[PDB]
């Protein structure tokens, strides 16, 4: 019961999924062939790890996942790679030809040729579930598949599963790792299109992750593998409530209640700590107080924005490892004296806490210290709107000259869809402004 199905879409979605599922296997002690010596329940069960993993008669533990891309080069590596025995071939879905950085091809031209088959495979995962809870959808903003196909899919999933919950992990574009000049277009179109179909979306700013890899881990020039390895630690923090259980453990949906005050305002800011190399961690236990402290440092955020210049609508702390409440409460008390974390006048100022006893791991060969304790803060602040502003600004500069727009019109789109998407984003920026203004 209470299963979650993960859908990884496009290159970023897929590679991030490789990272996340590798980490999950290691957190749960599942071997690359899917066996897990510790599960005495053969062929099924109702342990917490079963939210993400189905069991077979042979004792293989199988991700409740689907990987989807419009070309085959990235998923081929999964079919061929180290973890290839984990999935049934049907969970790995490829076409022949990609979306060429074009949202139209992703949502329409190429994407409509494969959407039925994807929904069919997802349906085979949902039929194995005794109480399906929802979907986790991983994708980039900037790609044609990650934007267009993800949008098409979300609309279809709303159709086929109703108001069953859908959460996003969305990869927001950075100029250092960027692949197309048209990413702001694809970003705006996919954000406008998915906004009504998504319940909670976690943005991951590639520039922030990148900055963090450079600064805290002294990686001269970070790769997708560096980024992904960090991102997955954040996603693991966020899903630990679903995948493990303990007394102090607090379910993600319970945080979700506090995180989304209005349907459109469903974009929480994540902040992770500690990010530290083995070199620097050797002979230093970083206490609850230090990691808690570092959560309020803007250089540790998934998204580049300044929360000091916005207002808080919610503040959640998700701890894992060797952590007891007394310490947390001390650390929070200190933060509350030394920081002025300001909330909007219509919400309470408490921090909501949860603790998972199971300590973090790392993937061998990585650059991250294996620490005893960690924390992800999820806050909802109006500052996140800066990230819409930047993107919207970029869109405007091109759109005012109609640059590259012909590539979209060539696939059967109208300019109207562009102006309509940009108006939705303008209204979202204005909503973020309004929630922060004090009451009558």
């Amino acid at each position: 019961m209470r299963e979650c199905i993960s859908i990884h879409v496009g290159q970023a979605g897929v590679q991030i999924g490789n990272a996340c599922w590798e980490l999950y296997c290691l957190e749960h002690g599942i071997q690359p062939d899917g066996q897990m010596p510790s599960d005495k329940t053969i062929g099924g069960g109702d342990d917490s790890f079963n939210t993400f993993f189905s069991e077979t008669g042979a004792g293989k533990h199988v991700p409740r996942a689907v990987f989807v891309d419009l070309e085959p080069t990235v998923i081929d590596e999964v079919r061929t790679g180290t973890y290839r025995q984990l999935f049934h071939p049907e969970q790995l879905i490829t076409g022949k030809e990609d979306a060429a950085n074009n949202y139209a091809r992703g949502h329409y031209t190429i994407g409509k040729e494969i959407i039925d088959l994807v929904l069919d495979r997802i349906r085979k995962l949902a039929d194995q579930c005794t109480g399906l809870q929802g979907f986790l959808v991983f994708h980039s903003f900037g790609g044609g598949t990650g934007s267009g196909f993800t949008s098409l899919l979300m609309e279809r999933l709303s159709v086929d599963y109703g108001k069953k919950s859908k959460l996003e992990f969305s990869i927001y574009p950075a100029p250092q790792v960027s692949t197309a000049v048209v990413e702001p277009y694809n970003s705006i179109l996919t954000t406008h299109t998915t906004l009504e179909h998504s319940d909670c979306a976690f943005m991951v700013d590639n520039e922030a992750i990148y900055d963090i890899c450079r600064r805290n881990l002294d990686i001269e020039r970070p790769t997708y593998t560096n980024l992904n390895r960090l991102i997955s630690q954040i996603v693991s923090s966020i899903t630990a409530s679903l995948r493990f259980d303990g007394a102090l453990n607090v379910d993600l949906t319970e945080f979700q209640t506090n995180l989304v005050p209005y349907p459109r305002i469903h974009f929480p800011l994540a902040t992770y700590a500690p990010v530290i190399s083995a070199e620097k961690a050797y002979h230093e236990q970083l206490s609850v107080a230090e990691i808690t402290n570092a959560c309020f440092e803007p250089a540790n955020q998934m998204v580049k924005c300044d929360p000091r210049h916005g207002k808080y609508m919610a503040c959640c702390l998700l701890y894992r490892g060797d952590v007891v409440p007394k310490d947390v409460n001390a650390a929070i008390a200190t933060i509350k004296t030394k920081r002025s974390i300001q909330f909007v006048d219509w919400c309470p100022t408490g921090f909501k806490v949860g603790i998972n006893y199971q300590p973090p791991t790392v993937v061998p060969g990585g650059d991250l210290a294996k620490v005893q304790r960690a924390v992800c803060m999820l806050s909802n602040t109006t500052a996140i709107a800066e990230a819409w502003a930047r993107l919207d600004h970029k869109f405007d500069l091109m759109y005012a000259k109609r640059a590259f727009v012909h590539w979209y019109v060539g696939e059967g789109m109208e300019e109207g869809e562009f102006s309509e998407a940009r108006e939705d984003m303008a209204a979202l920026e204005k909503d973020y402004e309004e929630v922060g203004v004090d009451s009558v």
Binding site: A100, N101, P175, T179, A180, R221, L397, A403
Partner: protein, 421 residues
């Protein structure tokens, strides 16, 4: 599984084509008998972009050779790697083009066209997923220009959803085998503006001046020019031929390089004609451009750049950032992040470090102006025209092409003058 189909047409087209094949075959570890005798898995990972697999496990270029007279093509066979081509893909006529565009496009070219078409189909239908086509040709002759453009059009009817990419060689009166070459050029350009997705503008003027003024060859050969052309062609196809973290193909490139359909004419650049900063500076220098235009007389809409060799990723990032920072006036502000960068670990034969540059710059108007000035000097005093009406053409069609090309210049100017605010 992302096939490109290559077509060389006429004299220039076949020579630069042949060179292309030589260079890339060497880079991929393929001999003239078509065997893989090479040292890295990387040379084979995306080998089928350009080569078909075969009997006796051979690799065969997906190339089609085309000319209106057997001259240049027998030299192709006689030449090394002449044996690597597929003898059926040799499509030639007899009567020749006589350096006359109307002959390439309308008359004799029109008689030969369907046999080319049949081989094109044989090559496409064997493809798992066709990216599209690249044509090497010249715009000064008659086969390359006239029949190359006619080919483009005909292929476009059958594969209107595939990318058409040309390497087009532009006529200079230094190295200049005629006098009607402006007519031929204008006529071809007029076609190109409408029917290619992306055209690499290879200028003999610029090639000549590099060999003379820089390489110090006071008497440069076709062989010296084509040496330049081949290094370039290698350079700009590096991202197609090798696995990167970019995945390039012709569509993604067009999408990222072409902001308005008509403005698809690129200025290539190469370095060296050595450290990352020097590589980077030289590569943007007007002296290293394969089209004879100063980029400081215009502004870049878009730019792709690729560095080949083993070098610091961090350093290249810093240098490319630097170059945009310090020259910010020469990049339009209404296209954020318009300069892209790739690194390939494998250098071309004979170098430790190279850099290839592809620009969509409005300074290219300079080049179309050159052709326009020459063209008009003749035309208005109706010089050498009978040659053309000779074959059924109207004067109108000359007027229309000149207009179209002046329109293209006007357009490049208009986007050059455009501001963010």
């Amino acid at each position: 599984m992302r096939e490109i189909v290559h077509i060389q047409a006429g004299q220039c087209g076949n020579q630069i084509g042949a060179k292309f094949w030589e260079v890339i075959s060497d880079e991929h570890g393929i001999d003239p008998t078509g065997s893989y005798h090479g040292d890295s898995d990387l040379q084979l990972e995306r080998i089928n972009v350009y080569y078909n697999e075969a009997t006796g496990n051979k690799y065969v270029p997906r190339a089609i050779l085309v000319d209106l007279e057997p001259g240049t093509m027998d030299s192709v066979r006689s030449g090394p790697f002449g044996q690597i081509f597929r003898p059926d893909n040799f499509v030639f006529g007899q009567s020749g083009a006589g350096n006359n565009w109307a002959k390439g496009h309308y008359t004799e070219g029109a008689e030969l066209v369907d046999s080319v078409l049949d081989v094109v189909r044989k090559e496409s239908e064997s493809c798992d997923c066709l990216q599209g086509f690249q044509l090497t040709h010249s715009l000064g002759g008659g086969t390359g220009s006239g029949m190359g453009t006619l080919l483009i059009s005909k292929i476009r009817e059958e594969y209107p959803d595939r990318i058409m990419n040309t390497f087009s060689v532009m006529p200079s009166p230094k190295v200049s085998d005629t006098v009607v070459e402006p007519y031929n050029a204008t006529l071809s350009v007029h076609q190109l503006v409408e029917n290619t997705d992306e055209t690499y503008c290879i200028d003999n003027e610029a090639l000549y001046d590099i060999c003379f003024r820089t390489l110090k060859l006071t008497t440069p050969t076709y062989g010296d020019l084509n040496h330049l052309v081949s290094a370039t062609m290698s350079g700009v196809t590096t991202c197609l031929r090798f696995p990167g973290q970019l995945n390039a193909d012709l569509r993604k490139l067009a999408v990222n390089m072409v902001p308005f359909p008509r403005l698809h004419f690129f200025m290539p650049g190469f370095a060296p004609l050595l450290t990352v900063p020097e590589l980077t500076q030289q590569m943007f220098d007007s002296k290293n451009m394969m089209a004879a235009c100063d980029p400081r007389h215009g502004r870049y809409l878009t730019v792709a750049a690729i560095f080949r060799g083993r070098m610091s990723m961090k350093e290249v990032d810093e240098q490319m950032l630097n170059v945009q920072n310090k020259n910010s006036s020469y990049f339009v502000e209404w296209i954020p992040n318009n300069v892209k960068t790739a690194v390939c670990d494998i250098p071309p034969r004979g170098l430790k470090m190279s850099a290839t540059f592809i620009g969509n710059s409005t300074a290219i108007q300079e080049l179309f102006k050159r052709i326009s000035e020459q063209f008009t000097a003749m035309f208005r005093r109706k010089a050498f025209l009978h040659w053309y009406t000779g074959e059924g053409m109207d004067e109108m069609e000359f007027t229309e092409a000149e207009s179209n090309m002046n329109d293209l210049v006007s357009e490049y100017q208009q986007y050059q003058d455009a501001t963010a605010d």
